[PDB]
């Protein structure tokens, strides 16, 4: 953990070749105290995230980390809320520009590829700090099917069968890895139940249909929809009865 | 943006930030480039930390033209930026000359960009070393561009973690009469020496350039080449 000069204040290399500012931006993701889990199925992709409403004064309809980037692409944001809104607005602009310039919907992989290209500049130029947010995009592709892509402050990006971000990212990753090792192409209900079970077991909350937001994309309707409290309650009851 | 250089000369006459970028490079995944008599092979350790990562979603060995390909060792996002830059420079050269860019010219332009990032204001050097393979004039070409913007013509070389022992292995295992398939065998052996665990068809990425052009090997072909190892 050696340092020499301003390697901890700007995005320049440390003596051992580390960008400490980027790592601090990564640590900034857990500042929000929220964990998001995305699971990809055989014909669907699901993003679930806990929504915290500390007081009844807050309008719970506005506390949403689920953002509709496009009709066919949804995202869940983890980390600083303002940086999350910035990344969401930039992703929406890039999707619209792709649709205008190329005439077809932007692929999910390329959306986060462009977003990570944008965020890499923040890790090379020293006049700006990296965004302390993590984007998880889900969308139904024309041929590849469901796609889940985590998209981090460093400009790294990768596809995922099931990923997680936030405070409990590692425990949820272990749970989802254990579930995936069983090698089951889960149906829509199974993917939703797996994501909800991952979040609940890792957090030990025994969710109510007001503490989580679920957004799904399916092959039959390749559009991003946010589940209502009744739809979430159906899955919660199904999980409880088993 | 800052207009002052972030890379400066130390009292000992060293571009310290470039050395630190090279240190970041030496901590990346191992990469091996071997120039055979009939082609070049670029192999890398594309190992993930969990099965949840989609192995085929992102590729470390990426093509630039129909005959030029790159494999990096260092930081992923910097390599993606340099991949886009190399592709754009190749498109500019093709548009100007109506001919695919020679490997040496693309290496020179990419190294010029990497040097620009060692002198321009408010930016840090790229934390990647690029192994560039191509085929021109019926002859194979292998180059390595370091963070400083310096390019070297290599018969066989290794970058990243455990690259010094990989180089020493390549000295005792490479001859100019090697064929492309034997070059792939040697590159896989070089990766295996620095590899920890077992190499599957998914946790390494291999690409080859020959008279037919550059193409990244599919996981099935990598599986056959790996079964050839054991």
């Amino acid at each position: 953990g050696s340092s020499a000069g301003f390697d901890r204040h700007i995005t320049i290399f440390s003596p051992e070749g580390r960008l400490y500012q980027v790592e601090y931006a990564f640590k900034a993701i857990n500042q929000g105290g929220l964990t998001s889990v995305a699971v990809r199925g055989k014909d669907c992709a699901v993003i679930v995230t806990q929504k915290k409403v500390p007081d009844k004064l807050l309008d719970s309809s506005t506390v949403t980390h689920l953002f509709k980037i496009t009709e066919n692409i949804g995202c869940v944001m983890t980390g600083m809320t303002a940086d999350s809104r910035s990344q969401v607005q930039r992703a929406r602009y890039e999707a619209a520009n792709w649709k205008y310039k190329y005439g077809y919907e932007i692929p999910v992989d390329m959306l986060c590829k462009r977003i990570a290209d944008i965020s890499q500049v923040y890790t090379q130029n020293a006049e700006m700090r990296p965004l302390g947010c993590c984007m998880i995009l889900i969308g139904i592709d024309e041929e590849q099917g469901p796609q889940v892509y985590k998209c981090d402050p460093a400009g790294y990006y990768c596809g995922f069968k099931a990923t997680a971000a936030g405070v409990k990212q590692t425990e949820s990753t272990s749970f989802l890895e254990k579930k995936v090792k069983k090698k089951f192409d889960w149906t829509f209900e199974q993917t939703v139940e797996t994501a909800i079970t991952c979040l609940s077991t890792v957090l030990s909350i025994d969710f109510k249909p007001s503490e989580i937001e679920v957004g799904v994309v399916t092959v039959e309707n390749p559009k991003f929809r946010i589940l209502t409290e009744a739809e979430i309650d159906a899955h919660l009851v199904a999980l409880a009865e088993r | 943006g800052y207009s002052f250089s972030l890379t400066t000369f130390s009292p000992s006459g060293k571009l310290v930030q470039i050395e630190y970028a090279l240190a970041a490079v030496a901590g990346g995944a191992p990469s091996v480039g071997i120039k055979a008599a009939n082609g070049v092979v670029l192999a890398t350790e594309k190992k993930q930390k969990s099965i949840l990562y989609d192995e085929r979603s992102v590729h470390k060995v990426e093509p630039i033209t129909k005959h030029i390909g790159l494999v990096y060792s260092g930081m992923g996002p910097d390599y993606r930026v340099l991949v886009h830059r190399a592709r754009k420079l190749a498109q500019q050269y093709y548009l100007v000359y109506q001919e695919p860019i020679p490997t040496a010219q693309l290496v020179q332009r990419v190294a010029s960009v990497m040097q620009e990032y060692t002198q321009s204001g408010g930016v840090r050097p790229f934390g990647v070393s690029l192994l560039i393979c191509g085929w021109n004039e019926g002859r194979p070409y292998l180059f390595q561009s370091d963070p400083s913007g310096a390019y070297f013509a290599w018969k066989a070389t290794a970058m990243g973690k455990n690259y010094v022992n990989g180089k020493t292995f390549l000295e005792k295992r490479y001859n100019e009469d090697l064929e492309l398939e034997d070059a792939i065998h040697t590159a896989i052996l070089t990766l295996k020496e620095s590899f920890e665990g077992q190499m599957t068809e998914d946790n390494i990425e291999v690409g080859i350039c020959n008279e037919a052009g550059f193409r990244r090997l599919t996981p099935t072909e990598v599986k056959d080449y790996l079964a050839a190892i054991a």
């Binding site: 190329y102 692929p107 390329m110 590829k113 | 990426e62 093509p63 630039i64 886009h84 592709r87 754009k88 498109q91």
Partner: peptide
Amino acid sequence: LHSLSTG
């Protein structure tokens, strides 16, 4: 270029 980026 577009095809190379997309695949």
